[PDB]
Design a protein around this ligand. Structure first.
Ligand SMILES: [Mg+2]
Ligand SMILES: [Mg+2]
Ligand SMILES: [Mg+2]
Ligand SMILES: [Mg+2]
Ligand SMILES: [Mg+2]
Ligand SMILES: [Mg+2]
Ligand SMILES: [Mg+2]
Ligand SMILES: [Mg+2]
Ligand SMILES: [Mg+2]
Ligand SMILES: [Mg+2]
Ligand SMILES: [Zn+2]
Lengths: 131, 106, 62, 107, 100, 50
RNA sequence: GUGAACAGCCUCUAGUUGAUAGAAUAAUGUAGAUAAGGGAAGUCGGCAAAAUAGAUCCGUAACUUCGGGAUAAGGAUUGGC
RNA sequence: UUCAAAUGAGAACUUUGAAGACUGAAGUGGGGAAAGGUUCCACGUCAACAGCAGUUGGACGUGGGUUAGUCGAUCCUAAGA
């Protein structure tokens, strides 16, 4: 309603969703594809210097490094720590598709979660080495 | 350094008018005087005694008449006597409890 | 009754502002008799006129 | 008829939508109208301590509810046109909510 | 009772705009003293005796001025310009009698 | 001005002494046609112009 | 006190509380605001508003009287403990 | 801006008290220079004036009040006369 919220979260100024970013980080192939992008003229930094967590392009590697050293990036990293909150959570909290939601939570805790954590560890150490 | 200081309070006017208890006042001082930041730490430092008219505090470790007045006003407030009884200094380190000015009813 | 002069004289005698002087609203006739600084001093001595304390500006938060 | 009662006044719905500089003065006028309604007395006198309670949070911070003690007493002066008047006092309580009208015994 | 005491203290105090008057400069009444001490549950025998002594000490004894001048007033013609005895009156000093 | 000249103060003294209504006994004289002071001055109405 | 600050905002000493009032809350005004989707299609003309703004760091073109242009432009950030 | 009392024929506007606010030390504070000339202060007091009111007033009526070897003028010279 207020002008600040309206002009920041207007639909035409929307940002990528956290479950989508979680899926981007879960698989190694997505990580490598987002790390190594073709030279695009219309992205900042020619499509390079892309932070996957924030889904954000930086103009330069020094800009990406100063961004990684920041409370904003750490806030996003903390947000991407848990279950990505699909519609299945709301359905289960209503008491509907409970077995489906529980199976999804079990899969996150067993397979998809630790693989995402290992990919994030490898990505962070690669960024430390190259920056 | 740690010279013994003596402070005395005269409670005779409220005691004789029957609105004060010197023993309770002394017990409140014993239980609430702080030494190095804690209550109940009066070991061989502060001694509080009374005989029904005069309450005597003997201290060797960080005590002042301003602190004594502060504690007395707290006790009077707790007993709802703060609106009627005040703590006055007569000579240096001797004090008394005195009523405020009251007009006769007529 | 008009006690404007007595209020001004009380402020001058006590040495504070006019904002700091209390005239007893029950003793209006006695205060109205007092046309000199000497009578004002007598009223201050017996308590018909009282000096108020300063409004507190604490520095605990500072 | 000399009488004393305790009432609760809902100032919230009486001050709904009033300009901020006028809220507490309108509260004074509303309480006078309330006492007139409950006691039939056009002469209503508010205690200065009640006025303090109204104005306690400034010009626009009037409480939603107030507990009043209203006394209908006799006018002793011969010059007055009304033989009865109402004196409104504040009742300082833990909360002004959930209290009903009561008759205060006179001794 | 604690909530009521908070409410009464809030209605009493106005410390942001001015300081509270000093009790040592104020004076109060024995009726309020008696009712408050009775609420506290003390015995009011000694205080009542002190008040009885004070009331007996404050006696009213009339004098000759009370007999003579008590209901009278004036005893001097009120001036038309509020002047003292030897103060000139520029406007009226030339007209001796009140009819003129 | 606070620091004024003696000539100015002398004129001010004359003006002060002239500032008055009629004496009442002037009205009571035979054939009196003077009924008010038609040259009365006030500090906020007509300036003296030195 | 905040803060670079005789800024703005709040407070102590001191000083005021003056300026016709009361009740209602139609239109039209004067002063101030917010608005989905679009984004100058409005208009003689982006008039008016909006957007920008402090500080720290990265970085900064043509042209030039070599002194400038420059806070060019463009980016990262900012609480509390 | 509000409440009670007092005064008064009469009080939104006078006085005291009770409150709520404001100037916020580049003041709505405390003094002066030019100018004014009694406006200062007390007592009395409301016809007219204070674009409402008035018991109040810088209004109306009658008085009181300005004390210097050391503060100034006075003396010196300036542009000039
Ligand atoms: Mg509205
Ligand atoms: Mg829009
Ligand atoms: Mg066009
Ligand atoms: Mg067109
Ligand atoms: Mg340029
Ligand atoms: Mg302010
Ligand atoms: Mg302001
Ligand atoms: Mg005057
Ligand atoms: Mg008029
Ligand atoms: Mg005069
Ligand atoms: Zn990031």
């Amino acid at each position: 309603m207020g002008r600040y919220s309206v002009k920041r979260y207007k639909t035409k100024r929307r940002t990528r969703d956290l479950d989508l970013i979680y899926n981007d980080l879960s698989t190694k192939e997505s990580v490598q594809k987002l790390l190594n992008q073709p030279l695009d003229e219309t992205k900042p930094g020619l499509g390079q210097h892309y932070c996957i967590h924030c889904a954000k392009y930086m103009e330069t590697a020094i800009a990406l490094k100063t961004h990684l050293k920041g409370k904003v990036h750490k806030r996003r990293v903390k947000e991407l720590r848990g279950v990505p909150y699909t519609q299945e959570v709301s359905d289960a909290a209503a008491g509907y598709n409970l077995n489906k939601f529980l199976n999804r939570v079990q899969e996150i805790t067993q397979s998809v979660g630790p693989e995402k954590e290992s990919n994030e560890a490898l990505l962070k150490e690669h960024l430390d080495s190259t920056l | 350094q740690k010279i013994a200081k003596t402070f005395t309070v005269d409670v005779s006017s409220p005691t004789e008018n029957g609105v004060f208890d010197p023993a309770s006042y002394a017990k409140y001082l014993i239980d609430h005087i702080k030494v190095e930041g804690a209550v109940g730490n009066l070991g061989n430092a502060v001694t509080v005694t009374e005989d029904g008219t005069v309450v005597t505090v003997v201290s060797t470790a960080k005590f002042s008449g301003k602190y004594l007045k502060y504690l007395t006003k707290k006790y009077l407030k707790k007993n709802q006597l703060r609106d009627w009884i005040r703590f006055v200094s007569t000579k240096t380190n001797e004090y008394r409890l005195a009523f405020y000015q009251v007009t006769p009813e007529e | 009754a008009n006690l404007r002069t007595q209020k001004r004289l009380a402020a001058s005698v006590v040495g504070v502002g006019k904002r700091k002087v209390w005239l007893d609203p029950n003793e209006t006739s006695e205060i109205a008799q007092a046309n000199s600084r000497n009578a004002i001093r007598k009223l201050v001595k017996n308590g018909t006129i009282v000096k108020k304390a300063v409004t507190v500006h604490s520095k605990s938060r500072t | 008829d000399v009488v004393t009662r305790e009432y609760t006044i809902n100032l919230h719905k009486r001050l709904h939508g009033v300009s901020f500089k006028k809220r507490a003065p309108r509260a004074v006028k509303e309480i006078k109208k309330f006492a007139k309604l409950h006691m039939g007395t056009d002469d209503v006198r508010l205690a200065p301590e009640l006025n303090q309670a109204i104005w306690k949070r400034g010009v626009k911070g009037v409480e939603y509810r107030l507990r009043l003690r209203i006394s209908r007493k006799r006018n002793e002066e011969e010059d007055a046109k009304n033989p009865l008047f109402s004196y409104v006092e504040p009742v300082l309580v833990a909360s002004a909510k959930g209290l009903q009208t009561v008759v205060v015994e006179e001794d | 009772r604690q909530k009521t005491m908070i409410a009464e203290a809030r209605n009493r105090k106005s410390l942001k705009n001015k300081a509270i008057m000093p009790r040592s400069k104020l004076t109060k009444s024995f009726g309020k003293m008696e009712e408050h001490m009775s609420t506290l549950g003390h015995d009011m025998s000694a205080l009542q005796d002190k008040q009885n002594r004070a009331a007996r000490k404050n006696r009213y004894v009339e004098r000759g001025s009370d007999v003579v001048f008590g209901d009278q007033d004036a005893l001097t013609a009120s001036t038309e310009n509020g002047v003292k005895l030897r103060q000139t009156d520029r406007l009226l000093d030339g007209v001796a009698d009140g009819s003129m | 001005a606070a620091q004024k000249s003696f000539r100015i103060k002398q004129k001010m003294a004359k003006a002060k002494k002239q500032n008055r209504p009629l004496p009442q006994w002037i009205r009571l004289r035979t054939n009196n046609t003077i009924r008010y002071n038609a040259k009365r001055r006030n500090w906020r109405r007509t300036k003296m112009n030195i």
